[PDB]
DNA sequence: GACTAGATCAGAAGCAGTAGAGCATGCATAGTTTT
């Protein structure tokens, strides 16, 4: 039970944290543009 | 006759190349 | 049925359960005009076997490899089904380009919504990551828990809570583990649904389990109050009482 | 030796023979599938233009000829190819052996003199013509015909036939739990029965460990460059034949396909004039060459006129003794003469003499020597060769006279003078010690050529669809570690007294 | 837990879908300024 | 009578080897330009 909930939670942080770059990245510097 | 190649009949079987072996 | 007009494809894979000389018949028939070797017109490189002319076709970065999976589907459906990263194993200097807009490194894109089998897929490309260490882990999890409000789980309610159990004989001493009772269970069924089971009577600990033995209570008192944080002191029945109904009880009625 | 080689691989299809002794073991037919594929390799790498077979006995189908029962001819005697050793491949594995259970079946009886005449009849099926016919048996049972007497003496009266129409048989047996011994049946149908073969061999037999053994290099089979005339003189002529037994090894020429469908596409080329732009045949052409600020033309007759001098053939010119040789004067690889009694009767005698007294009398026939017509002549020197023979008695250095190339004034060039400085005692004999550390025995089969073998690894990886094309080791690399652990601190000392403190050679 | 894994996964889809539609608005609002 | 089989010779095709031509890579040196 431990491995699997903490193995799909850290493989989930990862794409939720790249999608956060983008948006971030987005709404940053394509708004200042 | 002695030593002869199982697949090229009229041929002797070539060795094996060795290389360089140091005495 | 033209829906393969003035194509290009090239397949270089005979290893599947379809033979291969049966997918250029079908591309026949659907009127790609299949080629025998790739091209500067060659539209793509079907291949579901990577065998040593697809790995020479991946060396060289001029033409994209699509699965055979793409040609079925184009088949069933009857129609240009655009090409997905889950179809395809390597992109051209343009084509790599093309696709960074649209979707992520992974599977998963950012103009159209998922489903559970993209994620899945978009799982399984993942390779690894053992970067972190437990305390790093749990305090993300709890994080998340807190901020997107899933603390209503069945589950990971145990997370925020640290507790310990009178295990051995004497307090703060790890050679004299109790080993064979019903407490051993009960800790690994708090470990289980998400509690943080420690070993050592920190200044941290929050929840103390006291069973049957009522002995230490008076230490457990006394340090209680020496430390500046305070833990309740709970009994095992309180947790046997909660699991059924998948709430942390009051613990008014089990001080 | 003129004609092909006929091989047929028979490979028993008994339940014995699906049976592994150990976890960690291959199973007869995997062995024998294997061998097989092994020997279709090396023939196709060394000789392409011989025949094979693979045929089935004790299977449940039956494909052949006369149809007979439970014999089933998977493939003919045919050239072989990829798609051949891709058909054998789908048995390799378990999953294969399956497979082939599914396809043929197994565990059924059979008859020995039946699949010895579908293998006779194979035989007789080819229109080409054999030098040599081959039958090897894989099999673990020793005993196939113990019950039925009849079946047996029927067998061995087949085997006999067989052996009267010239059929050679091969006995590769397999490891079997109780041991296969030859004595019991075997010793008849098997052509030649060896002393030592006759004990129970618990192991499979050394014969696969040879056909496993994958040949990757082309074997021309004997043939004569040119048969010239040695002239003695204007009325003493014999005829004498030039051999290589030297010849450089090239890949195969490309070939041009077409992209679209992949199959062979034939070139012209044709020279057009640009005004008319019509076909330009070779007799409206002619020949220029610029010298001293002049065009001189001359036809194309005439210049393939220029190289004439004499008829093709070796003419005499003397005897030299063997030391005005320079072993440093090498221009081209020499060749072999060997009489030839088919053109002039009494050759032979003459050219036996000349070698007997050319060895007597440690000298080398000089001789002009012109291969073809309208090639200008060269200058060569016959050696005699003796006939060496190593300790199996197996020829080594056959004997005749050996063809070297003279160069000419032209050939030779001019050194830079550079002064010479001699080198003090004790650096001789460091350098000495360091050459003595690293003796070995040199052999003229001792290196492979590193691109030919590479070429063929993958284009064998590429028609079999290899995963990846197999790495072949170099030999001609030299091996650094061993040199440098053998040598020790013999290499210190010499750069210590050879090359002054700061010298640093590498730049 | 032989349920855990789909409740994990309903969540992160479900907050995968949520910043998704901000991210694409965030680029629809743009492009069509 | 009709028909076939085996021996014999020549013609033609395939393959091996050589010579001749063409196309990359380097660099050796000198010439020219810049400071």
Redesign the interface.
């Given at each position: 039970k431990e491995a699997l909930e903490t193995d799909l939670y850290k493989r989930f942080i990862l794409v939720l944290n790249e999608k956060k770059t983008k948006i971030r990245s987005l709404h940053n510097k394509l708004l200042n543009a | 006759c002695p030593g002869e190649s199982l697949i090229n009949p009229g041929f002797k079987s070539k060795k094996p190349a060795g290389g360089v072996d140091f005495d | 049925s033209n829906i393969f007009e003035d194509v290009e494809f090239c397949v270089m894979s005979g290893?599947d359960s379809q033979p291969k000389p049966d997918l250029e018949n079908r591309i026949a028939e659907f009127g790609g005009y299949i080629?025998?070797?790739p091209?500067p017109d060659t539209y793509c490189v079907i291949a579901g076997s990577?065998?040593?002319?697809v790995?020479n076709i991946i060396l060289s970065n001029k033409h994209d490899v699509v699965k055979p999976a793409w040609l079925l589907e184009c088949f069933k459906t009857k129609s240009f089904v655009p090409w997905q990263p889950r179809f395809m194993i390597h992109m051209c200097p343009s084509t790599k380009e093309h696709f960074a807009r649209e979707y992520?490194?992974?599977g998963?894109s950012?103009?159209?919504?998922?489903?559970?089998n993209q994620?899945?897929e978009?799982?399984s490309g993942?390779k690894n990551?053992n970067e972190?260490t437990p305390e790093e882990?749990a305090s993300?999890?709890a994080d998340?828990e807190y901020r997107?409000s899933?603390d209503c789980?069945?589950?990971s309610m145990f997370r925020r809570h640290t507790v310990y159990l009178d295990s051995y004989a004497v307090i703060n001493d790890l050679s004299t583990k109790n080993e064979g009772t019903r407490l051993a269970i009960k800790a690994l069924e708090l470990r289980?649904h998400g509690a943080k089971v420690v070993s050592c009577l920190a200044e941290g600990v929050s929840h103390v389990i006291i069973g049957e033995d009522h002995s230490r209570v008076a230490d457990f008192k006394a340090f209680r109050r020496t430390f500046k944080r305070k833990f309740k002191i709970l009994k095992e029945s309180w947790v046997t009482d909660s699991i059924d109904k998948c709430e942390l009880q009051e613990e008014n009625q089990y001080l | 030796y003129s004609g092909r080689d006929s091989l047929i691989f028979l490979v028993d299809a008994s339940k014995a023979m699906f049976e592994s002794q150990s976890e960690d073991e291959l199973t007869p037919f995997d062995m024998s599938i294997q061998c097989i594929q092994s020997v279709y390799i090396s023939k196709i790498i060394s000789s392409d233009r011989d025949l094979l077979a693979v045929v089935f006995y004790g299977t449940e189908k039956d494909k052949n000829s006369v149809n007979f029962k439970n014999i089933y001819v998977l493939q003919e005697l045919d050239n072989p190819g990829a798609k051949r050793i891709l058909e054998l491949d789908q048995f390799k594995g378990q999953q294969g052996q399956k497979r082939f259970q599914d396809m043929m079946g197994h565990g059924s009886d059979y008859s020995l003199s039946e699949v010895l005449w579908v293998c006779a009849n194979l035989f007789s099926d080819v229109q080409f013509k054999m030098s040599h016919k081959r039958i090897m048996l894989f099999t673990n049972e020793d005993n196939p015909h113990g019950n039925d007497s009849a079946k047996a003496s029927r067998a061995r009266t087949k085997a006999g036939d067989l052996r009267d129409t010239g059929i050679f048989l091969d006995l590769m047996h397999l490891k079997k739990p109780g041991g296969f011994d030859i004595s019991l049946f075997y010793r008849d149908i098997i052509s030649i029965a060896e002393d030592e073969d006759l004990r129970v061999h618990f192991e499979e037999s050394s014969k696969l460990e040879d056909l496993l053994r994958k040949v990757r290099a082309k074997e021309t089979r004997k043939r004569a460059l040119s048969r010239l005339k040695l002239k003695l003189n204007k009325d003493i002529v014999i005829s004498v034949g030039i051999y290589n037994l030297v010849q450089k090894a090239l890949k195969p020429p490309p070939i041009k396909l077409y992209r679209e469908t992949n199959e062979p596409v034939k070139t012209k080329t044709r020279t057009f004039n640009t005004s008319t732009g019509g076909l330009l045949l070779p007799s409206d052409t002619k020949r220029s060459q610029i010298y001293g600020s002049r065009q001189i033309i001359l036809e194309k007759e005439e210049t393939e006129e220029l190289k004439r001098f004499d008829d093709p053939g070796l003419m005499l010119m003397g005897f030299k003794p063997l030391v005005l040789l320079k072993k440093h004067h090498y221009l081209r690889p020499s060749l072999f003469v060997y009489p030839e009694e088919s053109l002039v009767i009494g050759s032979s005698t003459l050219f036996s003499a000349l070698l007997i007294k050319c060895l007597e009398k440690e000298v080398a026939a000089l001789c002009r020597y012109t291969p073809r017509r309208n090639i200008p002549p060269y200058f060569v020197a016959l050696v005699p060769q003796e006939e060496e023979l190593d300790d199996q008695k197996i020829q080594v250095t056959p004997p005749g006279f050996q063809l070297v190339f003279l160069p000419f004034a032209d050939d030779k060039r001019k050194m830079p003078f550079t002064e010479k400085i001699m080198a003090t005692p004790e650096q001789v004999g460091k350098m000495k010690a360091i050459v003595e550390k690293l003796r070995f025995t040199y052999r003229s089969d001792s290196f492979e050529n590193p691109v030919l073998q590479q070429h063929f690894r993958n284009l064998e990886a590429l028609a079999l669809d290899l995963m990846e094309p197999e790495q072949a080791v170099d030999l001609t690399l030299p091996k650094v570690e061993a040199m440098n652990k053998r040598l020790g601190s013999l290499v210190d000392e010499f750069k210590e007294l050879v090359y002054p403190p700061d010298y640093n050679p590498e730049g």
């Open positions: - | - | 290893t080629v025998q070797n091209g990577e065998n040593i002319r790995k992520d490194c992974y998963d950012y103009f159209i919504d998922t489903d559970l994620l899945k978009v799982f993942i990551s972190q882990m993300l999890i998340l997107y899933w789980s069945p589950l289980f | -």
